[PDB]
Amino acid sequence: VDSRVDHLFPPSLYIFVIGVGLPTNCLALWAAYRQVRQHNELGVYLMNLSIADLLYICTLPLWVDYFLHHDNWIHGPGSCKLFGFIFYSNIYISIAFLCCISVDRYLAVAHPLRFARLRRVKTAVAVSSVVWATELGANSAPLFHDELFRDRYNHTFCFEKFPMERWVAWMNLYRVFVGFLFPWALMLLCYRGILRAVQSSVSTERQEKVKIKRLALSLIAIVLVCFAPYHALLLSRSAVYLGRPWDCGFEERVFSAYHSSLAFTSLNCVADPILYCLVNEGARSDVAKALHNL
Amino acid sequence: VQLVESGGGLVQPGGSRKLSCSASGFAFSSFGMHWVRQAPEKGLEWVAYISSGSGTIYYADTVKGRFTISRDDPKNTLFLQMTSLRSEDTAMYYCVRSIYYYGSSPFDFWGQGTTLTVSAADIVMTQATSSVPGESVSISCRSSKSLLHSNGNTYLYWFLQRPGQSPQLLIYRMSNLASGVPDRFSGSGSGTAFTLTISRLEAEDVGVYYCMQHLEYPLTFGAGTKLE
Amino acid sequence: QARKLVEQLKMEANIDRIKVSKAAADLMAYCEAHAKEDPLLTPVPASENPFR
Amino acid sequence: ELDQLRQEAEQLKNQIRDARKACADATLSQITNNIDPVGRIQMRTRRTLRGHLAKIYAMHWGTDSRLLVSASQDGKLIIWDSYTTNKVHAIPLRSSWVMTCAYAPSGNYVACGGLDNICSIYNLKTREGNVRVSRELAGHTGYLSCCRFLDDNQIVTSSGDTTCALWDIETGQQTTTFTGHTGDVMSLSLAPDTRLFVSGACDASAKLWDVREGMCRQTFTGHESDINAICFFPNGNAFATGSDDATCRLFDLRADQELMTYSHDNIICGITSVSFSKSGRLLLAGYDDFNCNVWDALKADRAGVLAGHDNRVSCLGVTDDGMAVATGSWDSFLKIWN
Amino acid sequence: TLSAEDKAAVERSKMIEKQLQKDKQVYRATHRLLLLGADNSGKSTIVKQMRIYHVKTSGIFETKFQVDKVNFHMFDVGAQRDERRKWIQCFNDVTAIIFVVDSSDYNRLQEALNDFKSIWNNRWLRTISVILFLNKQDLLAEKVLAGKSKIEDYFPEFARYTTPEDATPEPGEDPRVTRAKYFIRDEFLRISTASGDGRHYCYPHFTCSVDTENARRIFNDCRDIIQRMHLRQYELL
Secondary structure, three states: OOOOOOOOHHHHHHHHHHHHHHHHHHHHHHHHHHHHHOOOOHHHHHHHHHHHHHHHHOOHHHHHHHHHOOOOOOOHHHHHHHHHHHHOOOHHHHHHHHHHHHHHHHHHHHOOOOOOOOOOHHHHHHHHHHHHHOOOOOOOHHHHOOOOOOOOOOOOOOOOOOOOOHHHHHHHHHHHHHHHHHHHHHHHHHHHHHHHHHHHOOOOOOOHHHHHHHHHHHHHHHHHHHHHHHHHHHHHHHHHHHHOOOOOHHHHHHHHHHHHHHHHHHHOOOHHHHHHHOOOHHHHHHHHHHHOOO | OEEEEEOOOEEOOOOEEEEEEEEEOOOHHHOEEEEEEEOOOOOEEEEEEEOOOOOOEEEOOOOOOOEEEEEEHHHOEEEEEEEOOOHHHOEEEEEEEEOOOOOOOOOOEEOOOEEEEEOOOOOOEEOOOOEOOOOOEEEEEEEOOOOEOOOOOEOEEEEEEOOOOOOEEEEEOOOEEOOOOOOOEEEEEOOOEEEEEEOOOOOOOOOEEEEEEOOOOOOOOOOOEEOO | OHHHHHHHHHHHHOOOOOOHHHHHHHHHHHHHHOHHHOOOOOOOOOOOOOOO | OHHHHHHHHHHHHHHHHHHHHHHOOOOHHHHHOOOOOOOOOOOOEEEEEOOOOOOEEEEEEOOOOOEEEEEEOOOEEEEEEOOOOEEEEEEEOOOOOEEEEEEOOOOOEEEEEEOOOOEEEEEOOOOOOOOEEEEEEOOOOOOEEEEEEEEOOEEEEEEOOOEEEEEEOOOOEEEEEEEOOOOOEEEEEEOOOOOEEEEEEOOOOEEEEEOOOOOEEEEEOOOOOOEEEEEEOOOOOEEEEEEOOOOEEEEEOOOOEEEEEEOOOOOOOOEEEEEEOOOOOEEEEEEOOOOEEEEEOOOOOEEEEEOOOOOOEEEEEEOOOOOOEEEEEOOOOEEEEO | OOOHHHHHHHHHHHHHHHHHHHHHHHHOOEEEEEEEEOOOOOHHHHHHHHHHHOOOOOOEEEEEEEEOOEEEEEEEEOOOOOOOOOHHHHHOOOOEEEEEEEOOOOOOHHHHHHHHHHHHOOOOOOOOEEEEEEEOHHHHHHHHHOOOOOOOOOOOOOOOOOOOOOOOOOOOOOHHHHHHHHHHHHHHHHHHHHOOOOOOOEEEEEOOOOOOOOHHHHHHHHHHHHHHHHHHHOOOO
């Protein structure tokens, strides 16, 4: 059980995320609020996604240090328990609001004349509240554990043990399977249904159909390219532990790749503002008309 | 409009009885209903109040836990469930129709009344006079606390109970003549002391004049002035 | 048919017109005489307006 | 021959034009260029009235300056308490395509009408609690576009059949029918003394009528397009018109001309509602660019703007005590400004 | 804070608001339509049949019909004048406009084309789709089969016109009536496609006066229209 020279990639990537995803997410939050003012209940989910992204990107300045300084956390146990819970959530909050958006879009497009009670700002707010309550209470296990752990080779950990606790493996399994694949599968099914509905449209001009398909494929490709490697490797180093709990052969080799993938999973915070409030000409219109106020 | 009510009689102490008030001829669902009682030879005393939509219910401090008011809007009926009837709860109970919006006239229709006999920190209204055919007569009443609100409304009401029947609204909010009252009646006041002035009295204007405050619950009445 | 229009236009033709200067001065005079009682023109201070 | 009659009519029109040209000695701007400017005036939205489902086409203040009736395309008339933003009555109409409403001076009745060609009248103060239809006045061929109460028993309706009518409410028959327009009549303003009333139609003209005699007195022909709104100056000797050519104009009955024109090169949308203040110094006008404008009625310069709506302002009304301004819009919101 | 009567007034206002929310629930779930046409066009027969299957100077008529548990309003104007440019603003936000034209009356078909052009280019009817009922097809069948009344004379471009490849004459009928009816359809469609700008569409149908499958056509077109607007506001396009 040891570590590698992983001190440049996650820091240089979180710096880019800080530089791009604070202004883009503030603009996206403003545009989503603009949408809510018009009783577009998609705006509620867009605001919630922007909030999760914002309070994720506002807790990176700590892990950029935690990775610059080699793998040690020094801001007490209190910061490592709050900023470590915000950092290992908001992934399952972002990919829950993306699923909420895809289901909202599927209902509007594939059933345009039904379920009108489900498409309202009130029900959107209630669903957002339930989404925040779950995945923040059901992912709250790391709080009720000591989680600023030291070891031999001067590695002050934060939310880890390479010798994994009994719960950590099961909670990782839950992460991979009921925080990523389930919401991602629902996103994929919703966009497949949206494309099947758009296909039948008589009034859409077959280049708009191509634009819709190439946006719907990128929506479910960005999520996979950002979350699949980290979660597959988390599955790997959690499945090995059940086979050989008292072993460290795999972990030392896979440590650097694991932390680089964890750095990668942060690109789905500058991905969201673009793909959901900056790729269409209506929300860019809001950006243009509001930045022209000052 | 008409409010016919029944369910009264001789009740042994410690018993119970339910009063009913059947309304017909007006949109019952948009009116708040009151129960008002007066002892056989004494003045009126407010009992309870149920709001339109049944969302607000008030009781007098003397019947707070024993009585229960309820309504049935699809059936146009009003109820008063009385339990633990003492000998001090003998009166003849009234059904009053009241509606509240900007410029409405509450307490404008009163039922005929049903009689009930039981075998053997709020505002106070004083009408000091107790008794008084073509001449001007002025009645007066007073209050402990000023009835003038910050709105500009003086929540003073004037009622006339002719010898044989139920009270009839004459002036609401201290200066407004009710619908149907002749222009002879006028009302005035100053915030704490009030007066009612019949100009050219006629033989149909004899009876007992009652005052009211609607500033805050419970609503209090006053003894009442007699004219003979 | 057009005789009705002709008669109506004849009736509308001959009325007593006052010079435009007099009418303009009258509008100016009405606006000036009621200037102090126009809340929107001269704003009321924020204790008599019922929309405080 | 008919050519002779046409020539006589043309000669009479030329005579009227010549008399008007002779009577105009000085413009209003020349006389008014000495008075102090009104200055920038700012009004803030004191209240906002929520509850209308669809767009709002009509609104009329109460004579008590506190109540307010409003009409919307969902089929409701809502009576607001302007001070507390309460709702007093919610009147559901038989036809949802209403485009005018009025509140009686006494306060006992309201009227509304629209594409149904009927001016329904509602009784607000009944012995029963509900608000009932007192009478439905039928006889207009086109849609009713404006109605104004004279008293509890007389009402004046303008329609899109080139006709205004004077109804007797007790017996629903037209006492007088005012013909002479050639296009759809839209607006209608009663004189303060209720002896005359003006009407603007799609013929780009306005006429002053006599209620008692029933005959048109004057015809005004300023605008270049259909006239959408009209209202009397508080004096009773003037009125202002708003049309689709993005221009307001001020006429005078005694001078029988047009005194001043309110237009800006940067505003190109038509006016939808025109009202005056108590003194007549301010000419509040609604527009299609979502923003009401305030014009100085003596100088033709914008004193202020009322921008608080997300759709075009349809109705406008200044209260009788001059204390506030109501503004309804196609976004289903009323706002009280002061 | 505030007096007893004012509390009761606020309670009454709140009950009014509750009733208005109940009304909003049913207002947002009913799709409103505007029926237009000439006197010859059988819109009266259409509305009568729709009402059956599912007042002197009166100016508007309303018709409920329901297809697959979806509510529909249909309005037609009865007593209005010839001019239309003023009361057409009230229908700025309807779901669709149903324009009905008689295809068997070649004398008045140019006036119908001009009316459809004025509807399609109205400044207030942008983003409002039009459902085109090319009506009275049975009468057109005889009008074209019997050669007594010709069609090349009224429209001097029928000769240089070929039946489009997309044509689908289903039941089995002469090619001439198919050619003529698709010519009329393509006249209306060239007007439609000249200046659409992609913000609204025209859905043409070959209907008769007494047909059962008319409310289904309106339902399908309204489904498509609502779907398109949902694509617009939900940021898909």
